[PDB]
Design an enzyme around this catalytic site. Structure first.
Site, short mmCIF file in Angstrom:
data_model
loop_
_atom_site.label_atom_id
_atom_site.label_comp_id
_atom_site.label_asym_id
_atom_site.label_seq_id
_atom_site.Cartn_x
_atom_site.Cartn_y
_atom_site.Cartn_z
N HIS A 196 11.89 1.64 -0.29
CA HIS A 196 10.80 0.87 -0.65
C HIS A 196 10.91 -0.29 -1.24
O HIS A 196 10.10 -1.51 -1.44
CB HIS A 196 9.42 1.82 -1.04
CG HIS A 196 9.43 3.19 -0.43
ND1 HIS A 196 8.78 2.98 0.98
CD2 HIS A 196 9.89 4.41 -0.27
CE1 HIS A 196 8.90 4.22 1.53
NE2 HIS A 196 9.46 5.02 0.57
N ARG A 236 4.51 0.93 9.77
CA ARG A 236 4.51 1.53 11.01
C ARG A 236 3.46 2.60 10.83
O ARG A 236 3.76 3.48 9.73
CB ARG A 236 5.98 2.09 11.23
CG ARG A 236 6.30 2.81 12.41
CD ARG A 236 7.59 3.42 12.51
NE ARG A 236 7.80 4.26 13.67
CZ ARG A 236 8.14 3.75 14.81
NH1 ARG A 236 8.42 2.46 15.12
NH2 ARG A 236 8.27 4.71 15.97
N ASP A 237 2.49 3.09 11.61
CA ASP A 237 1.82 3.90 11.67
C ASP A 237 1.12 4.07 10.32
O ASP A 237 0.91 4.92 9.47
CB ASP A 237 2.43 5.48 11.66
CG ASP A 237 1.39 6.67 11.94
OD1 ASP A 237 1.99 7.99 11.85
OD2 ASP A 237 0.16 6.43 12.33
N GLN A 280 0.80 -1.14 0.08
CA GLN A 280 -0.03 -0.06 0.04
C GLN A 280 0.89 1.07 0.10
O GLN A 280 1.90 1.25 0.55
CB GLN A 280 -0.84 0.02 1.22
CG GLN A 280 -1.09 1.27 1.94
CD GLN A 280 -2.10 2.20 1.16
OE1 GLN A 280 -2.95 1.76 0.57
NE2 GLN A 280 -2.14 3.56 1.21
N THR A 281 0.39 2.35 -0.69
CA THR A 281 1.25 3.61 -0.77
C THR A 281 0.31 4.72 -1.20
O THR A 281 -0.51 4.41 -2.12
CB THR A 281 2.58 3.43 -1.59
OG1 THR A 281 3.15 4.76 -1.31
CG2 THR A 281 2.29 2.83 -2.83
N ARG A 282 0.61 5.95 -0.74
CA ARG A 282 0.00 7.15 -1.18
C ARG A 282 1.08 8.15 -1.44
O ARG A 282 0.95 9.35 -1.45
CB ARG A 282 -0.96 7.50 -0.14
CG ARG A 282 -0.34 7.60 1.38
CD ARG A 282 -1.16 8.06 2.31
NE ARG A 282 -0.74 9.35 2.37
CZ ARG A 282 0.22 9.87 3.33
NH1 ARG A 282 0.68 8.98 4.20
NH2 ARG A 282 0.77 11.19 3.28
N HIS A 332 11.07 5.25 -2.95
CA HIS A 332 12.23 5.74 -3.08
C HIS A 332 12.92 4.28 -3.08
O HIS A 332 12.32 2.95 -2.99
CB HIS A 332 12.83 6.54 -1.96
CG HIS A 332 12.01 7.88 -1.89
ND1 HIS A 332 12.04 8.35 -3.20
CD2 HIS A 332 11.25 8.55 -1.14
CE1 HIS A 332 11.52 9.90 -2.90
NE2 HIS A 332 10.67 9.53 -1.71
N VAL A 369 14.10 -0.40 5.88
CA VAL A 369 15.52 -0.94 5.52
C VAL A 369 16.12 0.61 5.58
O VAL A 369 15.46 1.55 5.51
CB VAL A 369 15.77 -1.51 4.21
CG1 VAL A 369 14.97 -2.86 4.36
CG2 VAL A 369 15.41 -0.74 3.10
#
Ligand code: CA
Ligand code: CA
Ligand code: CA
Ligand code: CA
Ligand code: CA
Ligand code: CA
Ligand code: CA
Ligand code: CA
Ligand code: MG
Ligand code: MG
Ligand code: NA
Ligand code: NA
Ligand code: NA
Ligand code: NA
Ligand code: NA
Lengths: 510, 510, 255
Positions: free
Chosen positions: A203, A289-290, A194-196, A200, A330
């Site tokens: 990821h 995280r969050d 998931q990403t919004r 980089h 990482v």
């Protein structure tokens, strides 16, 4: 895995043979029409394509109440975010159970017919508290009170067509389509990311490691519907994802766009995300995280704890039917020219490097170098194009009300002065005459990199029409961005103050 | 040499002790005011600073007639271009000899007080023929009929201040100031170079050679008032001159800007230029091939012969009192890595290279390489910034009247489609609603590099408000820039036609 | 001039022998290094020789060697002074110095990292890179272990087809040795040429000595496997991914 609830509720497929019939009904002169708002369009696309299985409509009060207090639909199915059709009183009043209404997009495209089950006025105070944790600054609470309608209309949906999108026709896969893409490749283990945000090097590394550990293929599944206020636009992000998917080993990853409207609802949203990815065909999911967290409020307190999402999802692990993969962020090890899990470094004195969001923003603002160990150069190039540095940014200088010098002459002096400098910026003395149709163009010129010289301020009740980014007030008041020594300061002295302010802020480089 | 007529008519200096008095009179409530037009401001600056010595006002009919037919003021002083104050009937009617009128700039800045000698309606047909050679396409004739007033007011001038300019305060030397700059350097031989264009390697070479042969220092004296329609803007040109003056041997050259309004009047203008440079302090002047020539008319015929200017000036050589230096244009010799006079090459089989204006324009349009033997790279960089290549140019697509598909949907489809492409261009669906205040902004957005999608055409009587550069009509008519196969062609097919047209024309590069 | 000597790596005694040999060759002076001709440390980390044993033994025979021994003054780079100075003359006064150890140099050559001109002339570095190419240019072998029950022919074919998708220029081959010494001895020749071999079965243990172990990786269920299988019959597509990701993690493939 199997869709949530057991059956993919792809209503487009279910109602294929009723399309002409529903379209004609939606266009009949006697039917009531509701024009969907931008968030409702994101939600209805997910209901109609089965992305929100088991949902087949917008929640009536029975299911809604149960979701608000128990994180479940009335029948007990796990479901943490209420999806309702919010309307205003004037519309809610001409509605009653059994009424069939047409739901349109852009007041022109028929999307679905909703059979009303109920109409209710929810307690937005309890919703805000129970679902979004109560902080008036929570993006969802702000939306819930300032934007959402006060009446919810529960009802079953019949599909005509999914919301129209002219961009990225190839990448907006529905759950049925995505499952077929996986099937044609014989992929039976897929871990979704998931990403919004832009992706980089870190990821790319974390997703490939996730794939290695779960013996699964990778699904990059970014949100392109509604995200957090202030996020990078989805066009820029999609360009970034298209570029980065090329940096994975051939045949390991697939990119598909998710038209979801996030609520930035942390732990509850993380659970909702797991269910949605399961509906879309993923066998595994990464919970960050969050995860889906909107950050900290004005007083600096977290809206959510950093591990609340991972813990809530873990509590429902036995009924989610989709495996959650541990989040191992990482970091770069200069001396070893590689990336390693942050939970495995240091303690033994190991040098690491990272660039925070604030720093990245700074570098893009000043046109500074951004290292390849942090982000692929082709990705950085895209970000610079969409977020150009100060010498390429537009701006506006507003001649404040306090000025008694000639506004015509001072505007002309500023224009002639600016035209001396190189650079290629386009300049214009812009008279808005307090008209909304002109005021709304100010940010369009600024966004195009242009420099506007505005001879007079607009009325206060028009402020909301003009964005404040790169707009500077020249005035004697202490609130002025460029403070005048006096109301009648000589034009040549005023011009110099403005030029030097602009240089100090990076708009001009000599 | 001595100013033309013997005395520098610097009226600012002459009237210094009358400034307060003239300013008060110019601001009195009973005095008639004429707001100077852009060309009149260029002319009055030159009269007031002595650049047009012996003139001390705008020509009355007596001097005017003599200039038109005899190229001389009534007293016999050589003077080839009539400088008159052209006004409309409504103003000419409230004027009579001896009346004193105030001449303003921008309806706010008092420039001078004119004591009326006469008011007359000149035969613009005879002026066009006798002074500009009669071709209705001559820039001056076009101006004379379509812009100039039909009544001329002859009269003596008293100075208050020179037209206000906020750009280049340092370089706009008056004749008195320039003569002092030459005097402080002990320069008693100075050869002036006229130009209204960028200067390339050939121009630097020809001016240094002129200096060598005349044992004179160099004055680069570009026109920054009004020049030929379509010329590069003076800001870009001044940047080019400031850059190139640095490529001369230290102490050989001086750059000063001339606020002249050229008439593009070839041979007569060349003579006028010689007189003006003499007033400004130059001892020598270079008269070019087709000097001050506006080119060829629509039928391809020359407005002036290529050597008419050099011949007319030669005929007046004994009374001009400023030496004319022969024009020796140079060209590049690749095999010898040097420049040589074109009148000295070939015949012996010698390879030469050159880049025409058309070719230079082409290269700037496509973003192609421009060789250092032709133009200094720092100059080329300036030209590219002011005239960016197609991938950086703005444009507008206008949805024609013929379209029957949804204009709202087609506009949205075009915007979403364009936003997919990289590049950094800013896009906007722009509704003008046939309002002049919005229509006039179209070229401002195009000039800023933006792409506008305009959902409907404006009325024909508004055409003049919108420039045609980079504006493309999408319609079924054969006049359309992007021709539709039919009025109801599917939106997706229309979008592709537009994208491919834009790519074919260089706006998008993939 | 090149010396065709067979060193014994015999430290102090070898240093004395070296002094005599250089004298025979015509040299008037000789430099005796720190741990001259020393083979390093043994498995337990102990030095085979003391760092100054060589200089001391040679000094003890100074009066009969008839060749002058010049003191060894190793130098180090001083960034802030853009020069080199004897290490016995620096520091103490707080002076910044830079150096690259053998381990670090090896690492840089393995990953294709930059090697500074203050450390080694670029033309020298270029030579070292050519002879010791970085991982994306190195050869390797993947050996299908004895434990595998999936089709070896199909898994080999799947690996070859998969590898051929990647760019780079590496040459690939499914290599059957049939436990023959004449074929087994070619494995390191293909690896040395930068090629990637897919070997469908292990060779017998008494043939191990014939195949060098550099860049040879065992795919098997055993804990000794370089690429460990979850099970003997793991699906071919899952095995292929394990191998590709192992190779990427080890630098052979860069995307
Ligand atoms: Ca409300
Ligand atoms: Ca925190
Ligand atoms: Ca004052
Ligand atoms: Ca007229
Ligand atoms: Ca000709
Ligand atoms: Ca038709
Ligand atoms: Ca030791
Ligand atoms: Ca099994
Ligand atoms: Mg859609
Ligand atoms: Mg002026
Ligand atoms: Na509409
Ligand atoms: Na918590
Ligand atoms: Na005004
Ligand atoms: Na002629
Ligand atoms: Na020892």
């Amino acid at each position: 895995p199997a869709p949530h609830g057991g059956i993919l509720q792809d209503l487009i497929a279910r109602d294929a043979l009723k399309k002409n019939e529903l379209l004609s009904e939606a266009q009949s002169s006697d039917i009531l029409v509701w024009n969907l708002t931008p968030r409702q369009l994101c939600d209805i696309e997910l209901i109609l394509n089965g992305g929100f299985s088991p949902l087949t409509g917008f929640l009536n009060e029975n299911d809604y109440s149960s979701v608000v207090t128990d994180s479940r639909l009335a029948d007990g199915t796990l479901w943490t975010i209420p999806i309702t059709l919010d309307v205003d009183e004037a519309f809610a009043n001409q509605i009653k159970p059994d009424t069939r209404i047409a739901l349109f997009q852009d007041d022109e495209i028929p999307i679905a017919i909703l059979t009303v089950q109920d109409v209710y006025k929810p307690n937005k105070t309890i919703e805000a508290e129970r679902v979004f944790r109560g902080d008036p600054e929570h993006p969802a609470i702000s939306y819930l009170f300032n934007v959402a309608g006060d009446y919810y209309v529960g009802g079953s949906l019949e599909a005509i067509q999914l919301p129209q999108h002219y961009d990225y026709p190839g990448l907006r896969k529905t759950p049925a389509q995505l499952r077929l893409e996986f099937q044609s490749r014989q992929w039976d283990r897929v871990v979704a990311f998931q990403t919004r945000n832009p992706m980089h090097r870190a990821h790319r590394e974390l997703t490939v490691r996730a794939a290695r550990e779960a013996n699964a293929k990778v699904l990059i599944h970014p949100v392109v519907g509604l995200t957090k206020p202030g996020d990078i636009d989805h066009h820029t992000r999609v360009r970034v994802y298209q570029e980065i998917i090329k940096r994975y080993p051939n045949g390991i990853a697939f990119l598909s766009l998710l038209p979801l409207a996030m609520r930035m609802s942390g732990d509850r949203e993380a659970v909702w995300h797991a269910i949605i990815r399961k509906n879309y065909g993923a066998s595994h999911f990464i919970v960050g995280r969050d995860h889906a967290g909107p950050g900290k409020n004005s007083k600096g307190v977290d809206f959510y704890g950093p591990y609340d999402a991972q813990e809530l999802v873990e509590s429902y692990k036995h009924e989610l039917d989709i495996e959650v993969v541990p989040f191992r962020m990482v970091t770069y090890l200069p001396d070893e020219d590689r990336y390693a899990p942050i939970d495995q470094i240091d303690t033994t004195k190991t040098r690491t490097l990272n660039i925070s969001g604030t720093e990245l923003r700074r570098r893009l603002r000043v046109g500074g170098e951004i290292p390849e160990w942090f982000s692929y150069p082709e990705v950085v190039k895209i970000l610079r194009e969409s977020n150009p540095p100060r010498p390429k940014q537009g701006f506006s200088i507003v001649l404040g009300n306090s000025l008694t010098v000639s506004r015509e002459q001072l505007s002309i002096a500023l224009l002639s002065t600016f035209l001396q400098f190189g650079g290629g910026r386009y300049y214009k003395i812009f008279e808005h005459n307090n008209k909304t149709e002109l005021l709304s163009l100010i940010q369009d010129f600024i966004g195009s990199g242009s420099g506007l010289i505005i001879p007079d301020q607009w009325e206060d009740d028009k402020d909301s029409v003009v964005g404040k980014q790169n707009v500077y007030l020249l005035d004697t008041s202490s609130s002025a961005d460029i403070q005048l020594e006096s109301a009648d300061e000589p034009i040549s002295h005023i011009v110099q103050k403005v030029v030097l302010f602009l240089e100090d802020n990076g708009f001009f480089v000599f």
